[PDB]
Write a protein that binds this ligand. Structure first.
Ligand code: HEM
Ligand SMILES: Clc1ccc(-c2cnc[nH]2)cc1
Length: 367
């Protein structure tokens, strides 16, 4: 992948394949993400359907089509404003102790002789934490990890990131069943003037959408630190913060995102018609030499690091403070807990947008 990025960055940073457009350079990627008025996120007809959702003309639909993720201002701002305080670093700092108790308790369950740290650490941690934040009880651990696995690029349902079917209907059942027992954020949404369909989409989004991505951040960090042999240095020079950011830049859990043009617009030398999809390659932009010196090297204390792995502009990941925090703690406790790590086996997440590991088998010595 990355060498193709490197080539496209040289020869067409903005590229039409006869179907859609694809952007590879940092400058044009950031331009696209921030120009919400020409590059829309409304890929699921949320705005056009909003009124009929609220007045009940629309009786049945896929709840996760209608969230802040697939909306433009003002609807987007109004939706996000309901939970932005909760996911701020100031408000999350309360959780540090809980996140840390949880982490070390998850480290305990690990067999240093041989274990899968995706299964033991990286998967359960984001799930335990978001459950705590939302007041939504992990009743069945297996259901929750299965629900988390529904999150995927969907060709070609362009706004959609949830696989449907019986497991999805189970998730809807679960959420209807716990609406009223939730923490205050859930109460905000439940008591709002949103349609029930939107209420479901909103909760499901917060509950589930961030699990695998955060899990991937943790896994990719473990991989990158091990391969490039930085564990000691990170621990000794205390580089956690900047290292995690370099992980995010180098191994982004979300490889790319997409927009649709609201009007004919100009990007670089190219002219993009209206109604065209524009795929924006975060992973490629994160290695643009114009912005990142030695962009193909992993510098654990890289600075500056204005990477795009949480996006840019009004859609800048709501979970970024949370993901950074969980990851920071996970790594810290991990690097303190073990001295030696060898990688026995890996199985990658196999699809196109999500970038991480289904299995990461290690041998660690105990400390
Ligand atoms: C390493 C972990 C994560 C990465 C790499 C990541 C990435 C991203 C990216 C690239 C976008 C921009 C999408 C776009 O512009 O179309 C978002 C986003 N993300 Fe995340 N994310 C992570 C974790 C989380 C977590 C933990 C949550 C919630 C619990 C979350 C929820 C959201 C939401 C709600 C939005 C929509 C924000 C809006 O529309 O204003 N993400 N994310
Ligand atoms: Cl295909 C896809 C894209 C983005 C996400 C995401 C961003 N923030 C949380 N989840 C999940 C799945």
């Amino acid at each position: 992948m990355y060498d193709w990025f490197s080539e496209m960055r040289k020869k067409d940073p903005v590229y039409y394949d006869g179907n859609i457009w694809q952007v590879f350079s940092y400058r044009y990627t950031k331009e696209v993400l921030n120009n919400f008025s020409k590059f829309s996120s409304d890929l699921t007809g949320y705005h056009e359907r909003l009124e009929d959702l609220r007045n009940g003309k629309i009786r049945f639909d896929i709840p996760t089509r209608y969230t802040m993720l697939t909306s433009d201002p003002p609807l987007h701002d109004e939706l996000r404003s309901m939970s932005a305080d909760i996911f701020s670093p100031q408000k999350l700092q309360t959780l540090e102790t809980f996140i840390r108790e949880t982490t070390r308790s998850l480290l305990d369950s690990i067999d240093p002789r041989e274990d899968d740290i995706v299964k033991k650490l990286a998967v359960p941690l984001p799930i335990i934490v978001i459950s705590k934040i939302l007041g939504l009880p992990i009743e069945d651990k297996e259901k929750f990890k299965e629900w988390s696995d529904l999150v995927a690029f969907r060709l070609g349902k362009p706004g959609e990131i949830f696989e449907l079917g019986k497991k999805y209907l189970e998730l809807i059942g679960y959420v209807k069943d716990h609406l009223n027992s939730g923490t205050e954020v859930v109460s905000r949404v439940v008591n709002s003037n949103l349609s029930d369909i939107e209420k479901l989409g909103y909760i499901i989004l917060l509950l589930i959408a961030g699990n695998e991505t955060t899990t991937n951040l943790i896994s990719n960090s473990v991989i990158d630190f091990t391969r490039f042999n930085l564990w000691q240095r990170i621990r000794e020079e205390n580089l956690y913060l900047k290292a995690i950011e370099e992980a995010l830049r180098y191994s982004p859990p979300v490889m790319r995102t997409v927009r649709k043009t609201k009007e004919r617009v100009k990007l670089g030398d190219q002219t993009i018609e209206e109604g065209e999809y524009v795929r924006v390659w975060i992973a490629s932009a994160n290695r643009d030499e114009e912005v990142f010196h030695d962009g193909e090297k992993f510098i654990p204390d890289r600075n500056p690091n204005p990477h795009l792995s949480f996006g840019s502009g009004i859609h800048l990941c709501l979970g970024a403070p949370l993901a950074r925090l969980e990851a920071r703690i996970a790594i810290e406790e991990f690097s303190k807990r073990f001295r030696h790590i060898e990688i026995l086996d890996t199985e990658k997440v196999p699809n196109e947008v999500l970038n991480g590991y289904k299995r990461l088998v290690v041998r660690l010595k105990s400390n």
